[PDB]
């Protein structure tokens, strides 16, 4: 009867199945590709200034 | 890479001011120098203010 930790391997190749699972599927419907049209729509982000003091 | 987009539209009304151009059809500019009141107008016989 030596030490054992194989209910810690299972347990941390649980957690990691399925986190990869999840961001997976995150990242299979965030990024898609679209099709035959293009990007329907457009970014138009504008970041303007400030008046930032310096003390 | 991106989830959804807001649009906003805003509208806004200008008045008239010192510092605007205005012009004619015959190319003569101006810059509007002062904003009088109605009583220092020059005005005709008949009374109606310019």
């Known amino acids: ?55 | 890479g991106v989830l959804k987009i807001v649009k906003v539209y805003l509208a806004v009304k200008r008045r008239i001011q010192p510092g605007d151009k205005m012009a004619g059809r015959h190319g003569n500019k101006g810059v509007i120098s002062k904003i009088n009141p109605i009583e220092d107008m020059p005005y005709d016989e008949n009374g109606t203010p310019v």
């Open chain 1, 1 to 55: 009867n030596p030490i054992d930790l194989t209910v810690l391997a299972e347990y941390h190749k649980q957690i990691e199945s399925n986190l990869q699972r999840i961001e997976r599927k995150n990242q299979r419907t965030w990024y898609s590709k679209p099709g035959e049209r293009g990007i329907t729509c457009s970014g138009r982000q504008k970041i303007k200034g400030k008046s930032i003091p310096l003390i």
